Amino acid sequence: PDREKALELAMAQIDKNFGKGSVMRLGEEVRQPISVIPTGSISLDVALGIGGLPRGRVIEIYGPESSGKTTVALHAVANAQAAGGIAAFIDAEHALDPEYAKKLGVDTDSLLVSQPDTGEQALEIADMLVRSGALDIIVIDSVAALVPRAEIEGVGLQARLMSQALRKMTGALNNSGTTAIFINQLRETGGKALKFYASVRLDVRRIETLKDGTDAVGNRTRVKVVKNKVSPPFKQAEFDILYGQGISREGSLIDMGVEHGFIRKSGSWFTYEGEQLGQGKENARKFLLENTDVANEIEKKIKEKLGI
Ligand SMILES: Nc1ncnc2c1ncn2[C@@H]1O[C@H](COP(=O)(O)OP(=O)(O)OP(O)(O)=S)[C@@H](O)[C@H]1O
């Protein structure tokens, strides 16, 4: 009696026992909710299937040095921040640059910065800040730097601390309603536990170096949503990170503009239905940069063509 009906019968019997994303089809458009924090990268949001990182979920962002993971996060902050939310940053790398975070929309001033000493203590104050219901987004910098009492003193495994604090904190993170980012690094650890708690796990790798006549004006980044318990996994995205300026909205809107037929070429001269923007993205960008009106609706043309 019909696979289709037998499958969906049981397939449903499944979500009931293991949450939602317990099972999915790479096709499915669905949803049935939101709370969702913009990432400043439209490409990544549509590639996330929900328009941004879900709130109340634990998210892991791993990749090499200079990839982007931090920039994304800081952006995530800026958004969940400029939307009346309270951001908590547990720094264990002591590498964060305010002047860069500020230049992205992060109200640094009202940004909590806890500088732990023990990977154990970090997760503690990180967990409390979570239970205090006030925070909406918390971001731990370095799942690496989260070393225990020992090691920092003088056998076992760091991962135990992780499984511990993660076991306890995933739950609370839910009812609480705070999305928690975990930057992980490239040594190519507690990583295992995390990998299995993250409702969304993103892989961030720097695909190619940007150039605009001068030199290194930034970098191209490709993100692969390798784990996605909210929407369908394995989707991906790409955006432009400008050396000291964040993600390039304007540029991101172009990549979309052409991929979604709104913008056109013809001599490499990017043009939006009639009017020209200029030859070579570096100029069409400069075009969208100043003219917000056009850019605005190019966003509004693309943002409509897809989910929400
Ligand atoms: N303080 C800063 N000032 C200007 N640009 C920055 C700064 N920090 C990062 N960037 C830019 O962001 C890119 C990568 O983002 P990162 O913050 O390094 O992300 P990761 O998440 O790649 O970071 P580690 O983990 O490598 S800092 C760099 O190649 C820079 O162009």
Curated annotation (Swiss-Prot):
Disruption outcome: Not essential in the absence of DNA damage, its deletion renders cells much more sensitive to DNA damaging agents such as UV light, ionizing radiation, alkylating agents and DNA gyrase inhibitors and desiccation-induced DSBs. 5-fold decrease in survival, loss of HR, no change in NHEJ (non-homologous end-joining) or single-strand annealing DSB repair.
Signal peptide extent: none
Binding residue positions for ATP: S66, S67, G68, K69, T70, T71, D97, P98, E99, Y100
Keyword check for Plastid: no
Effect of Q185 to A/E/N: Loss of residue movement, loss of switch function in crystal structures
Entry binding sites for phosphate: S66, S67, G68, K69, T70, Q185
Alphabetical GO biological process terms: DNA recombination; DNA repair; SOS response
GO molecular function, one term: ATP hydrolysis activity
Location relative to the cell: Cytoplasm
GO cellular component: cytosol
Chief subcellular location: cytoplasm
Keyword Membrane: no
Coiled-coil stretches: none
InterPro entries: AAA+_ATPase, DNA_recomb/repair_RecA, DNA_recomb/repair_RecA_CS, P-loop_NTPase, RecA-like_C, RecA-like_N, RecA_ATP-bd, RecA_C_sf
Keywords linked to the UniProt accession: ATP-binding, Cytoplasm, DNA damage, DNA recombination, DNA repair, DNA-binding, Nucleotide-binding, SOS response
Similarity remark: Belongs to the RecA family.
Function according to Swiss-Prot or TrEMBL: Required for homologous recombination (HR) and the bypass of mutagenic DNA lesions (double strand breaks, DSB) by the SOS response. Can catalyze the hydrolysis of ATP in the presence of single-stranded DNA, the ATP-dependent uptake of single-stranded DNA by duplex DNA, and the ATP-dependent hybridization of homologous single-stranded DNAs. Numerous X-ray crystals have been resolved under different conditions which indicate the flexibility of the protein, essential to its function.
Oligomeric form and interacting partners: Polymerizes non-specifically on ssDNA to form filaments. Interacts with and activates LexA leading to autocatalytic cleavage of LexA, which derepresses the SOS regulon and activates DNA repair.
Record's protein name: Protein RecA
Source organism of this protein record: Mycolicibacterium smegmatis (strain ATCC 700084 / mc(2)155)
